[PDB]
């Protein structure tokens, strides 16, 4: 395919995406020194998707990391595989990016959008053709939500043709020090719905819930959850990274997946839930993967899909596997759950098969759905926002920073209309 | 003395063409180094194999066909496959980005910026021809490249050459190997804009080919080399009429005349019988009466539809080896048992037969083995309306709540096109249903 440009925002983005780069780089078998270790061509069939050659025809990841809190550069260059990146895009701010919008959205950051467009165009010059973008960020704080929406709009202006994809992390009361989050989340998704092509709801509420109620870890840190999300988003990327029969692409994924012109929020899931292990593992086999793919406590959104409907479905299986067996159980799952799925698009539950095992697990898969259950998450966020908003709170910060009340009101109008749209498409008929 | 040009569009088309051209080499004894000892190596030809190979003074027998792909992923494979030296210095067509399951992207946006090169290539090839009958295009109803670009190509060709006919080979994509979900919109949007510039089109259903390979070939994992080989065998069998030598059904015009009554009804259905399993050395012997008895079984047709409910127009046939027309007459008498047969009152009936005195060729190291007799009934049934009804159900479902519509509207198509094409296909299925 054509090349992909990766964009990384804020502390959360930098950490999550650095771990993701590590995960796939191990998967594609590339050394920290850029040395080559892979033992087959099937590893480098789609290495050009992300990695670019060096002067020594040494493959280098192509990504950009953005933030304003200048303490992140050393965090980048102190990870295990951190020094992997080109010493040209470690461009950051110098005076902090306190979690206030219109500071990174209007006040500043808008002064460095020239810098970020300069760097992204500079490294897409070496890109023979452009496929799309990978913005990783979270919905809280300026560097993060505000910069992410600003970047999305800017590149949408400059590149109206290609695709625009992003990963969303929604901060939650369960693990959050600050409290100015719901304002950030709603102000973000308002830009996000109307300005991107597809987005992944990598939630924290469901993440914490499952990690504490089954994985039962004492202190969910930026280490554990970083590992979980890096693994899952690697699993999502595999389908493009691998050659598959369901030989899907970003534009193809949009066309196949995107049901409406404003409902492009996915629910990345993973069947074999995995903590920080040492040995190979305790063994898992096919029917276990079948069951745990679509359980109630394995996704990344605190919702039970049996209370809703799927617009579409998608999966990407891993490891040496019986394709006929897989098709048999999938046919049964689409047979024994007739009401579970929408009647608007038959032949929606698509399936693919991959070969390279995950670097640590034998037989796994990667669930990338598109449900009508996401209304629960959006309703949650909007309700907490308006609870913080019915009486003013810190809102003087925003108003004195540049917004007005009308922008907040219209953001809520847009979100509640979106929830109405999801409700409507969730209660269709024949 | 009557040239012929074929053309391949899309991944399915190029793969089928790859699977067919080497069968075509095998049939005449043509080999990537072959020379066919009865020639002068300088245009030594004008026989029925001249229609495809325009052999040069180097005794090469270069073909008349080009391959189309919006992004090089299969056309490269034929460019570096097995018969590499068999094609000109970059006569093929390579793009840079596929339509990605979007009929509109190939019909309005992308192809409308690459089509002129394709037409220039087609015209440049045709100039070396002298007596061209028409084109034989290979496409599928599944993707947006092999469908939108095909319909656009139909329009361009009918603009530049309306006198000449152009037979078609199509695929009615199946859920089993469904590499998208937006196939039905492409299928309706291609059948609607195909009629006015189509003359006779064959659909081979990957549902049917998949069923045949999984059942009667002892293969459980039908890659794009198994179904592809089987379809190549069927296509070679059907076009053998014009291909090898002279008999029934010489020309594409003759295809129309003895097949299509009504220009809105020009999708002939092809049946087959010899489905040799594998390298299985010994099962039993075979009889011509047996294969012609089998060519009526609904399980053995290239498209799933049970014809015991409807009437036939003109049930042609072909045969390989072991001529015995009296046995054929006995076969007609037997099948006259009227348990599952019909014809139409207005026009009398003809079971035209043409014999090829060469035993059928087989893939050397494939999932088949050589046999001695073959037969293929092209029954222009009225039952072919089953496929259109089945696809109409799905198109209607998806258009109920306007799913995916933006992905077509926002690229140069209007909203009314969907509705008018649906109405037009309704008229078409009415036109089939009324005959009787
Ligand atoms: C009702 O009174 C209350 C008071 C406090 C609390 C919890 C209290 N509150 C907050 O400030 C949370 C969001 C308000 C934002 C506001 C809305 C953004 O514009 C800010 C801004 C930033 C920089 C410059 C100018 C403006 O401020 C902050 O995030 C700052 C970060 C900066 C100052 C380092 O502080 C923190 O992040 C803390 C103090 C470490 C986070 N923690 C808390 O325990 C709860 C209640 Cl109910
Ligand atoms: N060769 C081949 N193709 C098949 C088979 N079954 C289905 N297909 C179709 O192969 C098509 C892939 O080629 P296109 O339709 O041109 O795909 P596209 O996205 O328009 O463009 P490309 O992928 O670049 O070709 C899909 O539409 C499938 O439906 C099969 O058995 N063989
Ligand atoms: N660093 C980090 N933060 C996370 C993660 N998951 C959720 N978060 C939340 O994301 C928010 C951090 O926002 P941040 O990008 O730091 O805003 P900034 O201060 O403008 O850079 C906090 O609410 C975190 O709780 C994670 O894996 N890593």
Author numbering:
A (entry chain D): 1 to 430
B (entry chain A): 1 to 436
What does the paper say about this structure?
The cryo-EM reconstruction shows that Cp-52 is bound at the interdimer site, immediately adjacent to the contact region between β-tubulin and α-tubulin, and oriented with unit A toward the right, unit B toward the left, and units C and D toward the viewer, when the ring is viewed from the outside as shown (or when a microtubule protofilament is viewed from the luminal side with the plus-end up). The phenyl group of unit A and the isobutyl group of unit D are exposed, whereas the aromatic ring of unit B is in a deep pocket between β-tubulin and α-tubulin. The aromatic ring on unit B forms a pi–pi T-interaction with β:F394. Cp-52 unit B fits into a pocket on α-tubulin formed by the C-terminal end of α:H8, the N-terminal end of α:B8, and the strand between α:H10 and α:B9. The aromatic ring on unit B makes contacts with α:A314 and α:C347, whereas the methoxy group engages in alkyl interactions with α:P261, α:M313, and α:W346. Relative to three microtubule reference structures, α:H8 in Cp-52-bound tubulin is rotated an average of 23.4° clockwise, as viewed toward the protofilament plus-end. This reorientation accommodates the binding of Cp-52 between β-tubulin and α-tubulin.
Cp-1 and Cp-52 bind primarily to a site on β-tubulin that overlaps with, but is distinct from, that of maytansine as well as those of rhizoxin and PM060184.
